[PDB]
Design a protein around this ligand. Structure first.
Ligand SMILES: *[C@@H]1O[C@H](CO)[C@@H](O[C@@H]2O[C@H](CO)[C@@H](O[C@@H]3O[C@H](CO[C@H]4O[C@H](CO)[C@@H](O)[C@H](O)[C@@H]4O)[C@@H](O)[C@H](O[C@H]4O[C@H](CO)[C@@H](O)[C@H](O)[C@@H]4O)[C@@H]3O)[C@H](O)[C@H]2NC(C)=O)[C@H](O)[C@H]1NC(C)=O
Ligand SMILES: *[C@@H]1O[C@H](CO)[C@@H](O[C@@H]2O[C@H](CO)[C@@H](O[C@@H]3O[C@H](CO[C@H]4O[C@H](CO)[C@@H](O)[C@H](O)[C@@H]4O)[C@@H](O)[C@H](O[C@H]4O[C@H](CO)[C@@H](O)[C@H](O)[C@@H]4O)[C@@H]3O)[C@H](O)[C@H]2NC(C)=O)[C@H](O)[C@H]1NC(C)=O
Ligand SMILES: *[C@@H]1O[C@H](CO)[C@@H](O[C@@H]2O[C@H](CO)[C@@H](O[C@@H]3O[C@H](CO)[C@@H](O)[C@H](O)[C@@H]3O)[C@H](O)[C@H]2NC(C)=O)[C@H](O)[C@H]1NC(C)=O
Ligand SMILES: *[C@@H]1O[C@H](CO)[C@@H](O[C@@H]2O[C@H](CO)[C@@H](O[C@@H]3O[C@H](CO)[C@@H](O)[C@H](O)[C@@H]3O)[C@H](O)[C@H]2NC(C)=O)[C@H](O)[C@H]1NC(C)=O
Ligand SMILES: *[C@@H]1O[C@H](CO)[C@@H](O[C@@H]2O[C@H](CO)[C@@H](O)[C@H](O)[C@H]2NC(C)=O)[C@H](O)[C@H]1NC(C)=O
Ligand SMILES: *[C@@H]1O[C@H](CO)[C@@H](O[C@@H]2O[C@H](CO)[C@@H](O)[C@H](O)[C@H]2NC(C)=O)[C@H](O)[C@H]1NC(C)=O
Ligand SMILES: *[C@@H]1O[C@H](CO)[C@@H](O[C@@H]2O[C@H](CO)[C@@H](O)[C@H](O)[C@H]2NC(C)=O)[C@H](O)[C@H]1NC(C)=O
Ligand SMILES: *[C@@H]1O[C@H](CO)[C@@H](O[C@@H]2O[C@H](CO)[C@@H](O)[C@H](O)[C@H]2NC(C)=O)[C@H](O)[C@H]1NC(C)=O
Lengths: 420, 420
DNA sequence: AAAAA
DNA sequence: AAAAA
């Protein structure tokens, strides 16, 4: 494949929730809200948004919180740019219940096309892919739902990638697949049409001029059915990256459960666990795990995390460390539903970086839809170094604790920490 | 296949080392030495012995211990029955070094055919199958090497199965394969001749009148190359038995390491571990692990055992308990090489029983040769109940300790227990 | 934000 | 008894 001769730059945007403060003053990136506002201001031809749910108002949460202001602003911008001529298209998973949808109808009346994709009746899951494609030259990919709490109340990790028409259209292709697949009546085709096929997969990634220095990047999609022949499955890419590492593997994910949740009877899913154990045993790879715990985390997950932190010895030089990153909450933020959590889902090695939109559980890789970006840069510094610095800042943060920490000591309510 | 109309009875023989005493007086079986002596006395037509090594003298150990007397007696019997007309045939793995072999030459001069099978040059391993076939009607299968220490100094678990011409010849077939395969020059055939093929495998086991009540039994062999089309691999049978269980799984094995030992670079082998985790998570199966620790155990093994004992929670009702069975030793028994250990390798469920000759490591299932017996009896009581009683006696014995036990507290030297 | 028999 | 670079 011909290299993409475009000034593809890339910014690691993150939304630090109020209260959280890293006392380093050395790493600084635009927040998710700032990047989204800039993309909307620069949007003049197209805007494709794949989202899980839309809660850009204090109305939909039934809360009176000023912190939603930024989110409301985004909604206002989304209302203003539709009449200007931008072909706004939004794919949002069909809600389980018939709850009112103020934002979606507000954009529909303005002129924004909305299609209700229903993953439950197609592959038995939800559509949890959160990404943007702006003018088909820039794009966004991260853990930020189209919510005000996502912008302010929870922590995110995403990439805004500018001037990359080639990686922007390869990402759209997924949005086009969602658009065609979830309009009405139509089901998953046996064979995907060539329009959705891609050429930049794991064996032949795409060459970009990522800040001048050449780099190899490509996107991975899920669930396996909604995947064309060219596209590399998200699980396969994740396993390849965790296997190719030879020095260290740093993982910061919201939820890591090696089981097929959201289904019964309970099923065991040892896919990422086996890869982590292989990498940490056969090779001297040091594995560092950073999970996030809140009030809506499965208490069984600890029982698996303890199964990994206990595998470390001298003879094979095994080294696995597991830490929980819990976002502190107060009385004011307690009343907000799904208020405080670290939703970042990514990992970084000494030779590659993976940034995804789905938690590390069997559903997100076999049923729930998701998208991830893989970047490998030959050289010292760059995107990989920036993400490694982000992960170490997270790792040494006061909010990151060991698996033996007392739950009451942590500010927020954690179900994975035994009391006293 | 037609059922084997033979009074196939079955005795669980075990060799309790001196010093060990279970204060129950309710379970009693003939020792391995007694059963071997009875088989030799009743031997008049044939005697096939597959063994790892031959140390039936105080000479070969270079020790002066009266406890070898029984072993010497066995050797004497093995010398006496050869001139009587018994076709004694012994398959013993070729030693790494050119050490003297008094017992093998003593039997060779009497008239016992000995063939030096060399597993290292054939499949890259050793021949660790310990079994007897006496007159092709009885047989023995257990963890007892042809050693005096095996008979007295270490603990064993084996089956002597009388009046079973059908299960005796199915076991011989393996000895015939070893005999032909390890004579001289000849290598492993691509396709095994029909003479070594068997009909009683996992899908179609053999029906026997095991103490009157019908039962389904069959044998499994390793390594996968020295296996005909009919024969079921040992690993496949082990996985099937650990998967079919629905209530509990009790495992008492000498060494359980989910790695490919005896080879470099270090390799990860998550085959039995994954099955145990699946059984204990998907179903409410209670898994109890009884490992044995001595002075020649890999210290890394604890790092994996802690990975299993830490997987137990309420939401999925997971329950895995790991215990170490350490045979106490004194100053007198310390000087004996490979003196005190619990060498039993078996497991029992609520519906099946597995008795093997090899430890639970990757080599023993992929390179090292081994044989195991599988029995499933429909009813309450019988062989399965006897083995379950044996396992619970072992589990509650004072010699069985938890993984957090202090090493100095245990009588013997254990490398898997952290000091103080 | 995929917690919700 | 498969501990032995
Ligand atoms: C590849 O090329 C792209 C294109 O330039 C680079 O993207 C730039 O990345 C740098 C650093 O990652 C960004 O610089 C940082 O911007 C942050 C956001 O600035 C906006 O928001 C603040 C909010 O108050 C406004 O005041 C400001 O005017 C902007 O609107 C700043 O917060 C950062 O400052 C932090 O670091 C400095 C030290 O440098 C400290 O003194 C500060 O206190 C603070 O801690 C910083 O300035 C830049 O904005 C990005 N550009 C764009 C267009 O997004 C990629 O980084 C590059 N890739 C690599 C690997 O280098
Ligand atoms: C299917 O059928 C076969 C054929 O009979 C059964 O095999 C018999 O199994 C029973 C019990 O498992 C055996 O009985 C036990 O024998 C032990 C060994 O006895 C020999 O060694 C002692 C050593 O001193 C000699 O004294 C003795 O004369 C024998 O030469 C005994 O040690 C056992 O005694 C224990 O239990 C009793 C209570 O019953 C206590 O009072 C004792 O103190 C001691 O704790 C016991 O007698 C029998 O020997 C086996 N027969 C053969 C030929 O091997 C299978 O058991 C059967 N299967 C099932 C499931 O029932
Ligand atoms: C993506 O590509 C566009 C197109 O090149 C970038 O916009 C360009 O940004 C540069 C500097 O950021 C601008 O250069 C400046 O121009 C002004 C006059 O407009 C001049 O006074 C300055 O000294 C400087 O030279 C350039 O004009 C501008 N071009 C356009 C068409 O907007 C954009 O910055 C790229 N994205 C990122 C994240 O860098
Ligand atoms: C395997 O099969 C052989 C053959 O049947 C069994 O040997 C038989 O054992 C029974 C009792 O154990 C003997 O019965 C006894 O016979 C004597 C006379 O010899 C009699 O006085 C007793 O009252 C009793 O009836 C039988 O004779 C004997 N037969 C032979 C040919 O040895 C053997 O016991 C079986 N194996 C096991 C473990 O049971
Ligand atoms: C919710 O949306 C409505 C209309 O878009 C706005 O407030 C509602 O309408 C009037 C005020 O305009 C009030 O009498 C209603 O009680 C309001 N509804 C609610 C649920 O408060 C406003 O845009 C939104 N309300 C907010 C953000 O509080
Ligand atoms: C063997 O492992 C031990 C601990 O598992 C190592 O000892 C130290 O352990 C602490 C806490 O785990 C570490 O912070 C140190 O870095 C370890 N090393 C030293 C020198 O203090 C020990 O180093 C390992 N290796 C050997 C040869 O004993
Ligand atoms: C070892 O075998 C030899 C011959 O089979 C026996 O003892 C050896 O020979 C004479 C006594 O017959 C002694 O002078 C030697 O010193 C003995 N050898 C050793 C190593 O002691 C006897 O059968 C065996 N020796 C034992 C069991 O101590
Ligand atoms: C939940 O788990 C706890 C412990 O993991 C159970 O509490 C007791 O724990 C001890 C020691 O582990 C056991 O010996 C008891 O059998 C457990 N039960 C009781 C009633 O004491 C607890 O039972 C589990 N279930 C619930 C509903 O809490």
């Amino acid at each position: 494949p011909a290299p993409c001769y475009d000034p593809c730059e890339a910014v690691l945007v993150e939304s630090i929730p109020e209260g959280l403060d890293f006392p380093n003053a050395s790493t600084g990136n635009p927040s998710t809200s700032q990047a989204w506002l800039g993309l909307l201001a620069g949007a003049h031809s197209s805007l494709d948004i794949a989202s899980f749910y839309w809660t850009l108002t204090n109305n939909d949460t039934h809360t009176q919180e000023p912190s939603a202001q930024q989110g409301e602003e985004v909604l206002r911008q989304l209302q203003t740019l539709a009449p200007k001529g931008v072909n706004v298209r939004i794919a949002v998973s069909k809600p389980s219940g018939p709850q009112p949808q103020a934002d979606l109808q507000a954009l529909l009346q303005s002129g924004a096309q909305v299609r209700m994709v229903d993953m439950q009746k197609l592959t038995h899951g939800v559509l949890a892919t959160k990404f943007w494609v702006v003018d088909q030259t820039h794009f966004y990919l991260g853990s930020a739902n189209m919510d005000w709490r996502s912008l302010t109340q929870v922590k995110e990790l995403g990439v805004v990638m500018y001037n990359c028409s080639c990686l922007a259209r390869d990402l759209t292709k997924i949005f086009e697949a969602y658009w065609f697949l979830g309009q009405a009546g139509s089901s998953i085709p046996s064979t995907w049409p060539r329009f959705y096929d891609t050429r930049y997969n794991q064996e032949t990634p795409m060459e970009i001029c990522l800040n001048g220095t050449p780099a190899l990047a490509y996107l991975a999609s899920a669930p396996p059915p909604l995947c064309p022949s060219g596209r590399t499955p998200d699980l396969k890419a994740l396993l390849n990256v965790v296997d190719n590492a030879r020095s260290f593997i740093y993982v910061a994910v919201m939820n890591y459960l090696p089981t097929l949740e959201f289904s019964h009877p309970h099923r065991f899913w040892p896919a990422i666990d086996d890869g982590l154990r292989r990498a940490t045993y056969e090779r001297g790879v040091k594995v560092r795990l950073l999970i996030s715990c809140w009030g809506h985390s499965e208490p069984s997950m600890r029982a698996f995390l303890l199964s990994l932190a206990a595998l470390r010895d001298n003879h094979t030089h095994s080294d696995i460390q597991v830490k929980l990153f819990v976002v502190p909450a107060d009385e004011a933020q307690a009343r907000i539903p799904y208020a405080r959590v670290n939703a970042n889902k990514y990992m970084v090695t000494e030779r590659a970086t993976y940034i995804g939109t789905s938690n590390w559980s069997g559903n997100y890789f076999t049923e729930t839809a998701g998208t991830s970006l893989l970047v490998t840069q030959n050289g010292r510094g760059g995107l990989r170094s920036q993400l490694e610095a982000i992960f170490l800042r997270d790792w040494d943060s006061p909010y990151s604790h060991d698996l033996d920490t007392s739950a009451d000591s942590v500010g927020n309510a954690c179900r994975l920490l035994l009391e006293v």
